C-alpha cells in the first residue's frame, strides 16, 4: 500500500486540470518517497498539499441583476444612498466589461460606517465567496479559505503598513507569482476591495491604481433608523431573545446617541445597544418578565450616566477662543483654537502641531489685524508691545490645515479686544493677507460633525455655498449657515 | 534527486548561449549546494535566477 496513493490518487482527480502545473506536480511528486520521512522527506512533503487545494477549474456562476443587488444594499445598510448609486455603477459597468478591470475600489471613511459590510454585501449580490485579508502587518492563503477562484478579497487595511502592486496591476495581476510555491496563477476574475481611514499612509503608487469611494458618516436621523431597522434586532437576535423581549422608545435611542456616542460611524452605538441587549437578558432569565421597555428615563439604569456634552447648556461663551470645524481622518471634529496675550515683541509663537503650514496662515490673520486696526477696536501700539500665543489642536488633516484661518483670526481678535466668541458658532475658512476668505474642504463632513456636537451657527466661506446643496436634509435643517468672504463678516457674527 | 537539477537543467537549456557568462554561471553554481539553506545558502541562491531570464538570443525582428 504505502501513502504512495493517498495523495497521488486525489492528484489525478478531476481537480487539477491545467497541465502547465501538473508537470511541476508529478515532478516533485515522483521525487524521493525513497526513503522514509528523513529530514528531507518532510520538506517537499508538504509543498504538494498547498498545491492540492488551489482552485483552477472551479469558479462561481455570477448573477448580476441590478434590480436586486441595488435593493439588497437597501436591505443591509440604511442610508449610503449616494455610495450605493456608485456600487451599482461599478456593476452595470461590470456586466458589460465581461472581464473585471484594473480599477478596484477602496472604501474610505471613519471606522464603523460600514466599509467592511458593504463589501460582504457587494459580494452577497455577486454570489461570489467573501474573504477578509487583514493588512495590519499572503494571498497565498486567501484562495484556500475559499477554494473557488472567483472570490471577493477585501484588502481590509491598506494603510497600517510600515510595494505589492504586482497583485493588482491590470497588466500583471493575470500572471501571479509567490515564493515558497513559485508558480504563475490567474487572478482574472477576483473582485478586490479596500478599506481605509487616513488616506495618507496609503502609497501614492497604490492610491492611483485604485478608485476611491468615501463613506461619510450619518445624521442623527440616519443613525436612529440604522438602530431601529438593523442595529437593534441584530443585537437582540444575537443575545438570543425575542423582539417581544425588549423595545427602546425612539427618544431614548436619540439620547443614547447624543449623550453616549460622539462618533461618525455607529460602532460605539452598537456597543451601547448590546450593553442593553445584555442587561435585558439577565432580567428575562431571572425576573422572567417577557418584556423590557427602556425609556428616556430608564436609560441610566442600563448604560450608566451621561458620557458626552451636547449643546450649550453647560458651556459659557469665552474669549480669544474659537471653535473651528476640522476634517479629521475620522470625521467632522470640533477642535478649539486659543490665543494668549503676554507682553514682549511682535514675535508670535504657536503650540500644538509644529505646523510650518500653520505659521503662514497664522502670521496672516495676524498680518490682517496689523492693518485694519482702530477700525476694529484695538490699541494700534500692540504688535509692537505684546507677544501672542496660539494653540491649534492636532487632528485637521494636511489638505485642510489652512482651513483654520478665519478661526485663528477670530480668536486673535477676540483675544486682543477682550470681546468673546459666541460658544454656539463653529467656523471654518482660509485667510489671506487682505482679509479674504477663500474656499474650504469637505463642508459636508464638517457641518455633519458640527451638528453632532450640537452647535447652532456655522460660519464658512462664501464661495462654498454650492457645497451646502449635498448636506443631508436633517442637519442642514438644524443649522443656520452664515456665509462670509472677508474677516469682518465672520467677526461680526462670531463675536458679541 | 535534490533541487540540484531543477535549476541546473533549465540552465544548459537552449536559453543562455553566450559563454562569456556561462563561466560565471556554473561557477557560482557548482558553488555550495553544500550545505542546506544556511544564512549563506540563501544569498547566491537567488543571484542565479535573475540570471535565468535575461535575454540574449531573442532579437525581435524590427
Ligand atoms: N449604514 C449602516 N447600516 C447598518 N449597519 C451599519 C451601518 N454602518 C455601520 N454598520 C454596522 O457596522 C457593520 C458594517 O460597518 P463596520 O464594519 O461596523 O464599520 P467599518 O465599515 O468601518 O468596519 C454593519 O454590520 C453594522 O454592524
CATH number at residue A146: 3.40.50.300
Exp. method: X-ray
Domain boundary residue, one of A304, A338, A367 = A304
Residue A441 Cβ < 6 Å to ligand 1: no
In 10 A of CB A301, how many CB atoms?
Answer: 11
Residue A223 Cβ < 6 Å to ligand 1: no
| Ligand 1 atom nearest residue A111's Cα | 22
| Domain assignment of residue B32, yes or no | yes
The answer on A354 and A273 residing in a single domain is: no
Resolution reached, in Å?
Answer: 3.4
CB-based contact A303:A275 (threshold 8 Å):
yes
| Domain assignment of residue B18, yes or no | yes
| Ligand 1 atom nearest residue A109's Cα | 22
* CATH label of the domain that carries residue B31: 1.20.5.5270
| Domain assignment of residue A60, yes or no | no
The answer on A241 and A288 residing in a single domain is: yes
Q: Element (H or E) spanning B56, and its range? A: none
CB-based contact A300:A253 (threshold 8 Å):
no
Q: How many domains does one find in chain B?
A: 1
Residue numbers of the domain that contains A230: 219-304
Q: Kindly report the three-state secondary structure assignment for every residue of chain A.
A: CCCCCHHHHHHHCCCCCCHHHHHHHHHHHCCCCCCCCCCCCCHHHHHHHHHHHCCCCCCCCCCCCCCCHHHCHHHHCCCCHHHHHHHHHHHHHHHHCCCCCCCEEEEECCCCCCHHHHHHHHHHHHCCEEEEECCCCCHHHHHHCCCCCCEEEEEEECCCCCCCHHHCCCCCCCECCCCCCCCCCECCCCEEEEECCCCCCCCHHHHHHEEEEECCCCCHHHHHHHHHHHHHHHHHHHCCCCHHHCEECHHHHHHHHHHHCCCCCCHHHHHHHHHHHHHHHHHHHCCCCCCCEECCCCCHHHHCCCCCCCCCCCCCCECCEEEEEEEECCEEEEEEEEEEEECCCCCEEEEECCCHHHHHHHHHHHHHHCCCCHHHCCCCCCCCCCEEEEEECECECHHHHHHHHHHHHHHHHHHHCCCCECCCCEECCEECCCCEEECCCCHHHHHHHHHHCCCCECCEEHHHHHHCCCCCHHHHCCCECCEECEHHHHHHHHEC
CB-based contact A165:A204 (threshold 8 Å):
no
CB-based contact A185:A177 (threshold 8 Å):
yes
| Domain assignment of residue B59, yes or no | no
Distance CA A343, CA A390 (A): 14
Q: What is the CA radius of gyration of chain B?
A: 13
| Domain assignment of residue B60, yes or no | no
The answer on A465 and A327 residing in a single domain is: yes
Cell numbers standing for residue B37: 539553506
Cell numbers standing for residue A33: 518517497
- CA A277, A279, A280, A284 torsion: positive or negative? positive
Comparing C-alpha atoms, which of A126, A127, A190, A200 is closest to residue A161? A200
Sequence-distant (6+) residues with CB within 8 A of A12 are none
* CATH label of the domain that carries residue A289: 1.10.8.60
Residue A335 Cβ < 6 Å to ligand 1: no
| Domain assignment of residue B19, yes or no | yes
Residue A115 Cβ < 6 Å to ligand 1: yes
| Domain assignment of residue A257, yes or no | yes
Residue nearest to atom 5 of ligand 1 (CA): A77
Residue A226 Cβ < 6 Å to ligand 1: yes
CB under 8 Å, gap of 24 or more: what pairs does A299-307 form?
A: A299/A252, A299/A255, A299/A256, A302/A275, A302/A276, A303/A256, A303/A260, A303/A272, A303/A275, A303/A276, A304/A260, A306/A259, A306/A260, A307/A259, A307/A260, A307/A261
Amino acid at each position: 500500500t504505502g501513502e504512495v496513493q493517498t495523495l497521488t490518487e486525489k492528484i489525478e482527480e478531476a481537480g487539477m486540470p491545467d497541465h502547465v502545473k501538473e508537470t511541476a506536480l508529478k515532478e516533485l511528486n515522483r521525487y524521493e518517497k525513497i526513503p522514509s520521512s528523513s529530514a528531507e522527506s518532510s520538506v517537499i512533503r508538504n509543498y504538494i498539499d498547498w498545491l492540492v487545494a488551489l482552485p483552477w477549474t472551479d469558479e462561481t456562476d455570477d448573477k448580476l441583476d441590478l434590480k436586486e443587488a441595488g435593493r439588497l444594499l437597501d436591505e443591509e445598510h440604511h442610508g449610503l444612498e449616494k455610495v450605493k448609486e456608485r456600487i451599482l455603477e461599478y456593476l452595470a459597468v461590470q456586466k458589460l466589461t465581461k472581464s473585471l478591470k484594473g480599477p478596484i475600489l477602496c472604501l474610505a471613511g471613519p471606522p464603523g460606517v460600514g466599509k467592511t459590510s458593504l463589501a460582504k454585501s457587494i459580494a452577497k449580490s455577486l454570489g461570489r465567496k467573501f474573504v477578509r485579508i487583514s493588512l495590519g502587518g499572503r494571498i497565498i492563503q486567501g484562495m484556500k479559505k475559499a477554494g473557488k477562484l472567483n472570490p471577493v478579497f477585501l484588502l481590509d487595511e491598506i494603510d497600517k503598513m510600515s510595494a505589492m502592486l504586482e497583485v493588482l496591476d491590470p497588466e500583471q495581476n493575470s500572471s501571479f507569482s509567490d515564493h515558497y510555491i513559485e508558480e504563475t496563477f490567474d487572478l482574472s476574475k477576483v473582485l478586490f476591495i479596500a478599506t481605509a481611514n487616513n488616506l495618507a499612509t496609503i502609497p501614492g503608487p497604490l492610491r492611483d491604481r485604485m478608485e476611491i469611494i468615501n463613506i461619510a458618516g450619518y445624521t442623527e436621523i440616519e443613525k436612529l433608523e440604522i438602530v431601529k431597522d438593523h442595529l437593534l434586532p441584530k443585537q437582540i437576535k444575537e443575545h438570543g431573545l425575542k423582539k417581544s423581549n425588549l423595545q427602546l422608545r425612539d427618544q431614548a435611542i436619540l439620547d443614547i446617541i447624543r449623550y453616549y456616542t460622539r462618533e461618525a460611524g455607529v460602532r460605539s452605538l452598537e456597543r451601547q445597544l448590546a450593553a442593553i441587549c445584555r442587561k435585558a437578558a439577565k432580567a428575562i432569565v431571572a425576573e422572567e418578565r417577557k418584556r423590557i421597555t427602556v425609556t428616556e428615563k430608564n436609560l441610566q439604569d442600563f448604560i450608566g450616566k451621561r458620557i458626552f456634552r451636547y449643546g450649550q447648556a453647560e458651556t459659557e461663551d469665552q474669549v480669544g477662543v474659537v471653535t473651528g470645524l476640522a476634517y479629521t481622518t475620522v470625521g467632522g471634529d470640533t477642535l478649539s483654537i486659543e490665543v494668549s496675550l503676554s507682553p514682549g515683541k511682535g514675535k508670535l509663537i504657536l503650540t500644538g502641531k509644529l505646523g510650518d503650514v500653520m505659521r503662514e496662515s497664522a502670521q496672516a490673520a495676524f498680518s490682517y489685524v496689523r492693518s485694519k486696526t482702530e477700525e476694529l477696536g484695538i490699541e494700534p501700539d500692540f504688535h509692537e508691545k505684546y507677544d501672542i500665543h496660539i494653540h491649534v489642536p492636532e487632528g485637521a488633516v494636511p489638505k485642510d490645515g489652512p482651513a483654520a484661518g478665519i478661526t485663528m483670526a477670530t480668536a486673535l481678535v477676540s483675544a486682543l479686544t477682550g470681546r468673546a466668541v459666541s460658544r454656539e458658532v463653529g467656523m471654518t475658512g482660509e485667510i489671506t493677507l487682505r482679509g479674504r476668505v477663500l474656499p474650504i474642504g469637505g463642508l459636508k463632513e464638517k457641518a455633519l460633525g458640527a451638528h453632532r456636537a450640537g452647535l447652532t451657527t456655522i460660519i464658512a466661506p462664501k464661495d462654498n455655498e454650492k457645497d451646502i446643496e449635498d448636506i443631508p436634509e436633517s442637519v442642514r435643517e438644524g443649522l443656520t449657515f452664515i456665509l462670509a468672504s472677508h474677516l469682518d463678516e465672520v467677526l461680526e457674527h462670531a463675536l458679541v
